[PDB]
Every structure is written in C-alpha cells, then in structure tokens.
Amino acid sequence: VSSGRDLNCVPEIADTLGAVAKQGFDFLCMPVFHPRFKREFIQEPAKNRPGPQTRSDLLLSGRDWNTLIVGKLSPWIRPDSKVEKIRRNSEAAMLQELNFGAYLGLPAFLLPLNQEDNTNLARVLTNHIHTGHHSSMFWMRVPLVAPEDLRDDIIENAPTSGEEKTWMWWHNFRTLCDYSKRIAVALEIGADLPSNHVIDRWLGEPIKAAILPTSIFLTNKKGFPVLSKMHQRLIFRLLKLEVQFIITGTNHHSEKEFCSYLQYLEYLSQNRYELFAKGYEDYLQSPLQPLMDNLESQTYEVFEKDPIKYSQYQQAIYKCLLDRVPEEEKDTNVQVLMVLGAGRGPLVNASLRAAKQADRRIKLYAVEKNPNAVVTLENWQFEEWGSQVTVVSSDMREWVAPEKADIIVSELLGSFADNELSPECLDGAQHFLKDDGVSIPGEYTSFLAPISSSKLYNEVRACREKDRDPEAQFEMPYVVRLHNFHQLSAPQPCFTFSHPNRDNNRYCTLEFPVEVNTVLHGFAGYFETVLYQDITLSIRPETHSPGMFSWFPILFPIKQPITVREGQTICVRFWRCSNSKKVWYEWAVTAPVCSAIHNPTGRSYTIGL
C-alpha cells in the first residue's frame, strides 16, 4: 500500500506535508491555487488583480514537488459551462493551473470527471499535453457511481445506463484525448457499489489511484474504521493492480486519527506463477521462432526452469512405454525414441529417466538443428549419455534416419500451440515413425477469447517503429502476461492438430456471446495439449496446469477498438495460412461491426519455415 491524502485546504504547505507524512501517507493531493480564489482573465478591473496569483514554488524543494505532491484543479473551473464567459474563464484558468503544475514538475494532477459532457475539458487537456515538454500524469477523478444516483430520496416531488454511466464518461473522455498514455483514472469508491460486471470493465482501465472517502468506512465494535465485504472484495481486486489509495474527507471516527483509516488498508494488504510473472505484466514480447532463429543459452534456461512440463513429458513417455512393451517382453524389446528438437537436453533426460522408472529399454535419438545447442548435446552425450543417446545435428524435416521410431517426442509448442511450426516440423518428422508409432504431444488445440484493455492497446500503439508500416504493430501477435485487461467471454477452441496425421491451412469462425457492454481491444490465445492419454498441459485460464509458467498467452490486437453492447455477440474469424516459405495468421472481426483483415499475406508477421 502506497497511499495519499486528498486535502482541499492547505493553510501552510510545509506544515501540512509534515502532518500528512507523520500519519503515514506517501503523497498529498492538494490544490496548487486556492480553490476559492476564482480569477478573471477577460474583463476589467478584476483581470488586473495585483499580487501573486498563488503561493511560491520555493516553499518546497524540487524533489518534494516532483515526488510528493499531486495537484488538483480548482472546483470552480468548469470548461464545459453553458455560460460562455464562465467557459472562457475556465479554459484560461485550467490552462494556467496545468501550466503551473508543469512548472512545479508535479508527478500527477487530478481533474474531475463529474458530468457527462467533458469535451472542452478534453480539448484543453489535449492541447496542454501537446504544448511544451512536461511529464506530469493526469488522473481523471471519476466516481464509481454518478453523484445524482448517490443522492438521498428526500425530495417530495423529485423521487430517485444506470451503473454504466460514469464509465461512459471516462470512455468518451479518453477517446477524445486519443487514448493518451498520460491520462489515467483516479476512481472514487462510494458507499453503494455497482455490479460485478461493471467493476470488471473498470479493472481493465488505466486505474492509477483509487479515492476512498472516509464516509464509506463502517464501524466495528471497538470503533475503528472498517469496510463491508463487497468493499473489501473491491479493495483486494484493486490491490492486485497495484493502484494507490487516496483517503478523502474528514475524520468520521473522531476518537481515533487518520492513522486508523490508513492502518486498516495497511492491514488489509497483508491479508491478501505470479512470482515468476512479476515485472512482465502488460509487457509485450515477440513470440519465439526457434525454427528460423537460433535460441540463446538463456532462452533455454528459462525453458528448463519449469519442472511441471518436463515431469508431464516424463510421465507421458512412461505411460506410452508401458502401453508398448508388455512386461513379458520387458528385457528384450528396445524402443526407438526420437527427441526432435532436443534443445540443451531436458526432453532427452526426461525420456531416459522415464524409461528408467518404467523398467524398459530404449534407444534414443536427439535431433537438434541449433549447432550451439548441439555443442551442449554432444558434451552431454560424451559425459553422461554415451551410446544410449545418438546426437544428430540436423533439421528433423530433412534428416535421414537409420531406423524408424516407436515414439517421437517434441516440444515445438508455442503459446498458440502451432505458431512455432509444430505441424510442419512433425509432418516431415513422420516418415521415420513406425506404422503403430506414437507422437508426444499427440494432440494440441488453441483457444481464443475476446479481451478489453486500454493499457494493452496503448502498449501496442507504443510498439510503432519507423521504417515500417505505421499499423504493422497491430498485425503481430504478442506474448504478453495479461494483467490490466478485461476478458469479455469464455475461450473457445480455434485450431486442432493431431499427430501422426496419416494440409495445415485452417479457417475458424468463433461466435462469443458477450453478456455485458464492453469495448473490444483484441483476442487472447491459449492452448491445451494432450501429450499422452490423460497427460495434458494447458495454459487455458480455466484448466491451467498449476505452477507451469513456460507459456504466456498470445494477444492478437485489432487496429481499431470495437464497441460492444449487451447481448451483442462477437464473431471473429482466424486463418492459418502458409506457403512453401512462410506460415502466418490472419484474423478479422465480422460482428457486431467488421474490422479489416489483419496481417494479409503475412505482411506484418510470418513464422519462417
């Protein structure tokens, strides 16, 4: 928990930071100008008001301003007023306050999204962002529930898009500002929470802070501030995203102090694969291409630091060896195992100790095309394996085998199960398989699910490079640990390959019933694989193999987000296309609105054969 205090009254700034820092807060949301000091910019005599317009910058150090202060826009500044004088004064004053915050070098600046029309506010912010050089972030302070729905029913003649109102405020604002990286959410959490699907759309948004009023805190038997079960659930979900918490309001438990409001959150944090994926969340990577590019030693180390996958291959080889040599033929039947793409040698060791624990005899081949991994394989053979394992430095497709294989074992599976040309590699590695031979993995399927993520969309845009098509980045899959995203529907299977196959071009149409309002930003690709009969490896998030972190999901972006409504199904079509030299994917959304076909002819992403 990193927390701040939102004060709207700072008599002296140094004393106020002292009192805020004693209580344990890490920053301070404060007004840079006086919140009641309304200023005139067009009309005399109040336009020519003398003296300083605010307090000096010399009251805190530069590091204090750049680390400790989050500035607030003054409440009277309504750039979307219906009075033109008020509107122009508010444009001028908001520019003045934004420029002063840029001058102070504040890290963040709070602006309120408290009404439906915020277009002039969006324009003044867009023009500030594009003028000069400054690096302050902009936290739109948007409520979870609109303020005219949190009102009491105490008006006799005015009795009280209901839960999806303020999200559309935020969506309109961020769309006008063109999905800026420097505009994020500061979310206000009232006493009434919306449904679970509304809270999920918010959790796929750039939430950098969460405002918690002291009024939503209940009271325990000893008098301390606590939270309801739904509020605690929301705090836990927001603690997953590593947002910061802003305490607003006054002390509604006057016997204790704001240390109590802060200590409840500091307590509730400590009462909260995930360790491996720290620092890789929402960090896009290029999918590996082991067939075209020679992997580094460290890539293989990350491959081999996963024991669950290699235990699963060893168990599958164990079971296949049992179901191929009866125990009466145990001591005289030698099984030809061929490890295809042997790597630095973890599948060969798995085969060896699998035949050891199965009490069967195997003659093993380690085919590898990487000459530098062949160096390691040959050192392994010289020092450990000996004559049991024959190391071949060839490509399994044009290798000429001295004999046929009972079992072929490979790990040519990517995050989408076929984006590393496992079908093409096991097609050429099939003529040296016996007519009753087994392949491990014998089956693999890929799954797709539609997602929403503003952060992933901005990362994909930030992947734009020169000397390239300006939208090529949207036609590439990305291996990414999906963190700040919202999944719109359950995954459905896309492509299936089975080995041995006694055409790898594929076409799939998938309709996803989207039971909620959303905005589509891309598709997430997972996979399942059947190595042997009951032995499976899955990164699919409902049947995920526990602790098995060899694969992150794939993300296929779309060039333009597609707004989806309640009950509107999403139709996506994928193609697995190929020629003699290249293999690629193409995808297109065809419902509720069509998109372009992404990656035609593999112009942005091919897997090289």
């Binding site: 000893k222 301390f224 606590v226 409840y264 307590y267």
Partner: peptide
C-alpha cells in the same frame, strides 16, 4: 482494531 482491524476486525469487521
């Protein structure tokens, strides 16, 4: 102190 920290109990609902």
């Amino acid at each position: 102190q920290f109990e609902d």
